[PDB]
Amino acid sequence: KRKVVLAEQGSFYIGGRTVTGPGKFDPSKPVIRYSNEGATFYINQMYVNFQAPVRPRGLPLVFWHGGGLTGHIWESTPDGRPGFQTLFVQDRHTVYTIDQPGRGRGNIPTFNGPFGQLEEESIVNTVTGNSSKEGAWVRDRLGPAPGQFFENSQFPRGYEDNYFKEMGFSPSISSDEIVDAVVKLVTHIGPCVLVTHAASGVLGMRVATHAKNVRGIVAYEPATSIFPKGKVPEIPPLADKKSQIFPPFEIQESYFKKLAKIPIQFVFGDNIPKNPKSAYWFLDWWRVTRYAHSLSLEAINKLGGQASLLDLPTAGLRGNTAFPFTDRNNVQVASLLSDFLGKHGLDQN
Amino acid sequence: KRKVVLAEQGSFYIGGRTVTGPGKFDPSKPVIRYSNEGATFYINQMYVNFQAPVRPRGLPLVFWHGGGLTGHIWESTPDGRPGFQTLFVQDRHTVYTIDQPGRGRGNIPTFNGPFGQLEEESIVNTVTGNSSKEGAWVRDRLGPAPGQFFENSQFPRGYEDNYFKEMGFSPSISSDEIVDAVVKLVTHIGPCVLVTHAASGVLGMRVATHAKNVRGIVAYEPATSIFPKGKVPEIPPLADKKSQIFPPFEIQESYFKKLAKIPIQFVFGDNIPKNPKSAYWFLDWWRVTRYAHSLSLEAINKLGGQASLLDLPTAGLRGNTAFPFTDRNNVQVASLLSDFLGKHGLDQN
Ligand SMILES: CCOC(=O)c1ccccc1S(=O)(=O)NC(=O)Nc1nc(Cl)cc(OC)n1
Ligand SMILES: CCOC(=O)c1ccccc1S(=O)(=O)NC(=O)Nc1nc(Cl)cc(OC)n1
């Protein structure tokens, strides 16, 4: 249903730091002008929204959007059906949704001058990068080429404009500062579960190594693998003989071992090939990336962990894209998330 | 009272257009690359959130943040008290909150290359501008100089960092394209009331002249005045005898006359000086800007309109900043908005 009853809701800012321009502020001179004189700027802060049900049961959930996205992807699907925010408030969890630093209602650090530049210091790069509709189409596995859909597709076809409009650029904020803001949120909230997506996968793993309050991770289609420092296994190049997946993130073993203390599930949708696919770069990228993640989870398990890989087709769900939580069967995807939380008692007080 | 019962909630993207890079897309090639080759980019779209109560009464309200802000300002106050979104859902109105193009979850049009540049075309300027903590302090009339409060201030003291963290830059998207997005939303919604703030004041007036569905406007501390073309009255410079207020927006009389067909209220807080204040630029700016608005409302009334100026101190509310709807007495401010809606029948079906 669409009905939701909230004991309370709201939003707040957390994290970040300040930087300044030179000189002193004079309230008698024109305030609106091209200058950083006497100016203090808040940068790299994060936006957080929360919705709490009446009588919550179990741990709060923190939904962390993927690369170039915002908390919108947890609010509604492109065709207007309820997102995981509504579904999990109905499932009696308090739900936090974030816009990480650099995205959406999070801070974009720019000043008076060329983008990202505060006098002679470059806070973020002036040159940006960004995905396109065509690139996102194949990245998210709607189909093998733009305009084409896989046979089984759970994408909300007809709502392509709504979907692609939710995506945008990210300034070059360091990943350390993004992780820092979420660590501060986790400290503020208490024991919780991180639910991550694509680019935020590796970031949530890092947060968990810095914050014991992270009691579980569910990562949809994580984009970068993580390994103990020096211990990255052999990972093959892509079928084009030339490209590689994202360089795996390496952390000190004492931090990596903290991942063995909590339940971790990685979730993949459909249409990731089992064999090399030289004609379709992003399908082959997903094949090797998923392979790397299987090795990462094995390394966590070998250290005593509780890490698992869930392929949605093996659970009877066919046709999911890389955004299973906004696909047409997102209610069944949510059911599998509820199952994970129930298995580990994360839905009990 | 923090509880809210929602018949439905969600979010969506509306408006915008597309721009394209050179050439064609090949799915065999590396997709993550420094290139706009074959790229279609969605630009200048707007984010929209809605919450609908059970059995709504009257017209939906569209809350439109001021300059450099987002829909956060209607969700919560900096100290975590309920914003107008919650208060007006409780008051039985469906509530829309937007992040306009270029702000928050709205689109920031940038690509692969220097900020805002698509190959040789400048979609928005690479050089940005932004407010500082110090400039915003005096702009919002927390006090006469940064760090100092008016004795009577309604600002939630102690939550300064939270407040200033909600503010940011806006890329140089044309005002025409911002107005266009909101006109499209109003067409989608049907009859509605615009609630604007500061920079969005003039934009909401423009929307109403294009969209008969706007049935009322309440503008908090509007920043730019509006007049019929060629009929701008004499407006003095500031007390420094150098500076001017924002050049008034001029529109054809045929469009201006549409403003006389709906109830319009401009709402101002406290601590705007009656007399020239050369020592405090932004206090003097507000004095002359409020004067210009008084003449704008007079012009609407001479065309048969019903346009009023509400100074909160005359209603018994003292110390309000330029964000009365997040101040400590925001419940009393909300009551005055409910009074306006009820008097004009905008709270009945
Ligand atoms: C659902 C959001 O997708 C992701 O998080 C994601 C997934 C796989 C690989 C990279 C990313 S990413 O965002 O961290 N990075 C990109 O998607 N970058 C990127 N994507 C495309 Cl399609 C083109 C491009 O060109 C610069 N750059
Ligand atoms: C409450 C949000 O405030 C407004 O909407 C507002 C109000 C009055 C004047 C200008 C703006 S504005 O945003 O459209 N513009 C600015 O506030 N710009 C701005 N403010 C400051 Cl204090 C400094 C500055 O330097 C470029 N530039």
Author numbering:
A (entry chain B), B (entry chain A): 12 to 360
Question: Can you list sentences taken from the study reporting this PDB entry?
Answer:
SulE, an esterase, which detoxifies a variety of sulfonylurea herbicides through de-esterification, provides an attractive approach to remove environmental sulfonylurea herbicides and develop herbicide-tolerant crops. SulE catalyzes the de-esterification of a variety of sulfonylurea herbicides, such as MM, BM, SM, TM, TrM, EM, and CE, to the corresponding herbicidal-inactive parent acid. The structures show that SulE is a dimer with a lid loop in a domain-swapped β-hairpin covering the active site from the opposing monomer.
To understand the molecular basis for the altered activity by Pro44 mutation, the crystal structures of apo-P44R, the double mutant P44R/S209A in complex with CA, and the triple mutant P44R/S209A/H333A in complex with MM, CE, and TM were determined in the range of 1.32–1.78 Å. A clear electron density was observed for full MM and CE molecule in the active site of P44R/S209A/H333A, indicating that MM and CE was tightly bound in P44R/S209A/H333A. Superimposition of S209A/H333A-CE and P44R/S209A/H333A-CE complex structures also revealed a similar conformational alteration of CE. In this position, more favorable interactions of the heterocycle moiety of MM and CE with P44R were observed. The heterocycle ring was packed against by Ile43 and Ser142 from both sides. Additionally, the conformational rotation of sulfonylurea bridge results in carbonyl oxygen atom of the bridge hydrogen-bonded with the amino group of Arg150 (about 3.0 Å), while in the original conformation, the distance between Arg150 and the oxygen atom of the sulfonyl group of MM and CE is more than 4.0 Å, beyond the canonical hydrogen bond distance. The sulfonylurea bridge also forms hydrogen bonds with several surrounding water molecules. These interactions make the heterocycle more tightly binding to the protein. The relocation of the heterocycle ring results in a more stable binding of substrate to an enzyme and further improved the activity of SulE against MM and CE.
